[PDB]
Amino acid sequence: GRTDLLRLRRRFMRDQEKLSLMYARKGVAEQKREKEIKSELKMKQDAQVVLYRSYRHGDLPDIQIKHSSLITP
Amino acid sequence: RHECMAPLTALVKHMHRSLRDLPSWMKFLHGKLGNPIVPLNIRLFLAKLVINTEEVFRPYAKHWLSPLLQLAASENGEGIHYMVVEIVATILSWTGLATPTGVPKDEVLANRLLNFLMKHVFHPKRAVFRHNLEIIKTLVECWKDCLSIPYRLIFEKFSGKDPNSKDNSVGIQLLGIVMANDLPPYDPQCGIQSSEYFQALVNNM
DNA sequence: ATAAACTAAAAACTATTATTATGG
DNA sequence: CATAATAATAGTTTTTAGTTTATT
Secondary structure, eight states, rough: OHHHHHHHHHHHTTTOHHHHHHHHHHHHHHHHHHHHHHHHHTTTTTTOOOOOOOOOOOOOOOTTHHHHHOOOO | OOOHHHHHHHHHOOOOOHHHOSSSSHHHHHHHHHHHHEEEEEHHHHHHHHHHHTTTTGHHHHHHHHHHHHEEEEOOOOOOHHHHHHHHHHHHHSSOOTTTTHHHHHHHHHHHHHHHHHOOOSSSSSHHHHHHHHHHHHHHHOHHHHHOOOHHHHHHHHHTOOOOOSTTTHHHHHHHHHHHSSSOOSSSSSSSSSTTTTHHHHHOO
């Protein structure tokens, strides 16, 4: 219980801000509409492609790859 | 809110920059608070301070265990509930640093504070009431050391008016707080009858 | 001058549904 | 100006007051 004081202060609502809370919920909802629109438009695109091999850099191709690395692709 | 405390806060910051009961005057203030005679002006000054200074005396809060509790008990400024909840939040912000299970003084202080809060726990509001309930749950499940259940004030809280309109549900949620603990559902000790104690339950049922 | 039905039975029991007291 | 909400509304059967049509 470390956030317990933080839980207290975040729940210090007794300045009677019910209308303020609902308005904050409203603004959050509008931003959620915007962000959701953006996310939907983004995800219709092809998702990021997954790889299947480790890789190393040198002056030569490293033949030390394993059978798994070869056949998973 | 407190405003003259700002230099005190600067003092705390400076000392913690420079910083067992190694005295940087917390012996002086330790005595200044341990007495339940310290004036409410100075009492609340020290209270707000130690709220803001809980971090510095972690492997010290056990010695601070008794003051805060006796500070917590029978609190009599911005509001009694305000400082009560703030200080108990500070106390439970540590759990292994100190426990009110040593001298029976802290144990009885904790029990008396429990009675105070369960007397006080209610809101016309929704969450902050449930926030208090969760406060009770957190304290009982972080100590579980000397904590004992009255069941009597509890009984009248949940037995209620035989509600044609929901009111005693506060006592029901208190029972649920107990239920979250592995504590006995109701000690069949004397109580009042130990049999109808559940007849009132099934009545409100 | 209407004794049958003249004409449509004013009304709750016992069952559901949109309200918002609020949840956030 | 959003959302597990919630509940005051309504709608079915009874049984009164309207009325024809002979009835003398």
